């Protein structure tokens, strides 16, 4: 028995899953393309028409599911969309991340792009969770991508409006709904920020390989409203983790105003290569070199540096570098600027530096930059936030978001 | 009136254009989606079957036209694809260009990208012309993109093969058909290069604002076969023109094996920012600083450097720079490396230079590099080709294509 509703065809025996509101998703064909078919019931025909329009308006982007067509029966309405190979959930739940390279982060970056695309179209998803974040089929050359799905609970903000009342009840799924949506009072109407919070938890769900910032399933929602976030899978003294901690912590704040935008999250160091990181260090040092001590830039860079530098950075580096630096007298052990200024000098002159000092630093640029991030795991986080005072400047545009 | 073929609807009174073999294109809609439908007559039903299938294997790429569906009638066959705003022909022939800034080169880079994608899928267009390059309908934010269409005459190379016999006549338009396609004296059958020759003409067509590298319309195909190419639109002593010459002259090469691949074209200086050119001069200089004069790299950089440096480059730079460099007699005016190094030095210590030598150089980075490209209009093209000996080096990966 093969169901043929117009250009869509599927066999009822091939069920890919069950959805809510009696929606059943089969595997089928459309225009000889492999698609997933969704049967919707008359009780939901209206909810399905809005999802298709919001899909038609965004599937162009590579990180949004591709909507194809819709055919109607005397009994059902069928939605044909691009056939994937797995959800992010089964991915986090069943891949050997050790063999998986930097894929997990690029999946997080792609999902973030999709969100910024949707937010550029005044579309809020409201139901972002690892289940409806899909993994594309492997392409002709063997690559996969992440795409956003389940547009049933999406909302297009009204022209000229930048929030949305809580009239659609409490859209979303327990454990991933931001507090404003579930809180009994209405200090302010929700907005795009409810998506970041969901996204923040998802970032952690991937980098923890299964954990949630707000506890286990049954107590999540109650912790979310109570503010009981715990990012335990992230060391406090690891460079990578300290950077992730900064981002995810900002993404799951209780005040949705203090939550970053998706365009900001795309620029975050959490996504930077080592080559880029070292580059950010070089440019900060050059911008501050002739900045006075009374200047705001330098005063923000040095507020709280003693902990960043670990009291005295000269007492925390390798002996071959300590001796090399002792040759002159131009770097203070308490200055985070001078630590960055030292990194600039020892990079420029790297080739004309004694082999013993070259061997402690490592090859450029990856081993060089790691030398200083492992020793001072708060250096990038501290200086990134400090240098925000120069996000308008052309030189720094590659690191912040500032239209 | 309006003809409704299944989910495709159009009005015969809305004709967008006419093709070959009686194929008419109307403006229409598919699934509430503004599309352009194609009416295909019976003698041509098989050409569409191929095009549709090929389109379904590559339409995903942002710069390859998006194909939606295809229905059939009692006597006709219809094909609905993305509706565009113009073709590159109309864009070139009817756009100020003075207020278009750099949009035209972004277009050339986009059609290249889509063509590299098609080649990665073992597909040769074989009929690339400013007519098949359509411009996107403006976005939800006012941006456009170029795309490739007219896949009817495309060729999916046999499995493992990297060439194709001329068994299907000579597909393509008089004026854009590569010479290997028409001649019988050729021993080598055509490959993907045949698409690069055509693109190399379009490249020139766009920068010349309509002109062709092989003359006027009727004598064009005649001139192509004879190798008589003329790019008089490009000055022989202007930095920008020298670069575009180097690339175009290699894409329209008479010998197919001398033509850059699509991925090669994508890295050519023709597409670099001003800052990227500085970064190239800096990396080239830094890389050759500790290289033996007897070394192959140095011997290739100076092979012909006399015309490049215009004899003593110290005598072709502004006087203020001439005085500030007179103290260093290390710089040999007949060395291109010495010129590149003098640039590297002027860039690093730019802030500590006397104001006279700073305002004669210009604001970093754009005006600084222009100081040398305008004065030495062969410096880049000379260095880029000679330094190919280092294309394999990670340092230079941003600048060349290896694998
Ligand atoms: C696109 C798609 C949907 C629709 C998503 C939406 O629009 O909400 C889907 C639903 C279920 Br249940 C089950 C599978 C579904 N699937 C897939 O292709 C797919 C997902 C995981 C593994 C293999 C294939
Ligand atoms: C999508 C599209 C097609 C189909 C391309 C194909 O056959 O692959 C088309 C054909 C002609 Br003729 C003419 C126009 C065509 N057009 C356009 O949107 C368009 C292009 C330029 C100016 C105005 C509209």
Residue numbers in the entry:
A (entry chain B), B (entry chain A): 562 to 964
From the paper:
IRE1α, the most evolutionarily conserved UPR sensor that is ubiquitously expressed, consists of the N-terminal ER luminal domain that senses unfolded proteins and the C-terminal cytoplasmic region that includes the serine/threonine kinase domain and the endoribonuclease (RNase) domain, exhibiting dual kinase and endoribonuclease functions. IRE1α oligomerization and autophosphorylation under ER stress activate its endoribonuclease activity via binding and cleaving RNA substrates, triggering downstream UPR pathways. For example, IRE1α induces splicing of the X-box-binding protein 1 (XBP1) mRNA that encodes the transcription factor XBP1 spliced isoform protein (XBP1), which upregulates genes involved in the ER protein folding and secretion, promotes degradation of misfolded proteins, and further relieves ER stress.
The obtained structure contained four copies within the asymmetric unit, chain A and chain B formed a back-to-back dimer, and chain C formed the same dimer with chain D from the molecule in the next asymmetric unit. The propionic acid group of IA107 extends towards the pocket proximal to the DFG-motif (Asp-Phe-Gly, residue 711-713), which is a conserved motif located at the beginning region of the kinase activation loop. The N-benzoyl motif of IA107 faces towards the adenine pocket and interacts with the kinase hinge region. Crucial hydrogen bond interactions were formed between the propionic acid of IA107 with the backbone of D711 and with the catalytic K599. Another important hydrogen bond was formed between the carbonyl amide of IA107 and the backbone of C645. IA107 interacts with K599 with the observed N-terminal αC-helix shift upon IA107 binding, and the salt bridge between K599 and E612 of the αC-helix remains intact. The conserved DFG motif does not show any significant shift when aligned with the IA107-binding p-IRE1α structure with the apo form structure, with the DFG-motif adopting a DFG-in conformation in both structures. Despite that the interaction of the two protomers of the kinase domain remains the same, the IA107-binding leads to a more separated conformation between the two RNase domains (835-963) with a reduced overall interaction interface. The kinase domains of the two protomers interact with each other in the back-to-back dimeric conformation upon IA107 binding, maintaining the dimeric and oligomeric assemblies of p-IRE1α but the RNase domains are more separated, resulting in the inhibition of the RNase activity of IRE1α. The binding of IA107 did not impact the formation of the Lys–Glu bridge and the high-order assembly of IRE1α, instead, IA107 inhibited the RNase activity by separating the RNase domain dimer interface, confirming the formation of the RNase dimer is critical for the IRE1 RNase activity.
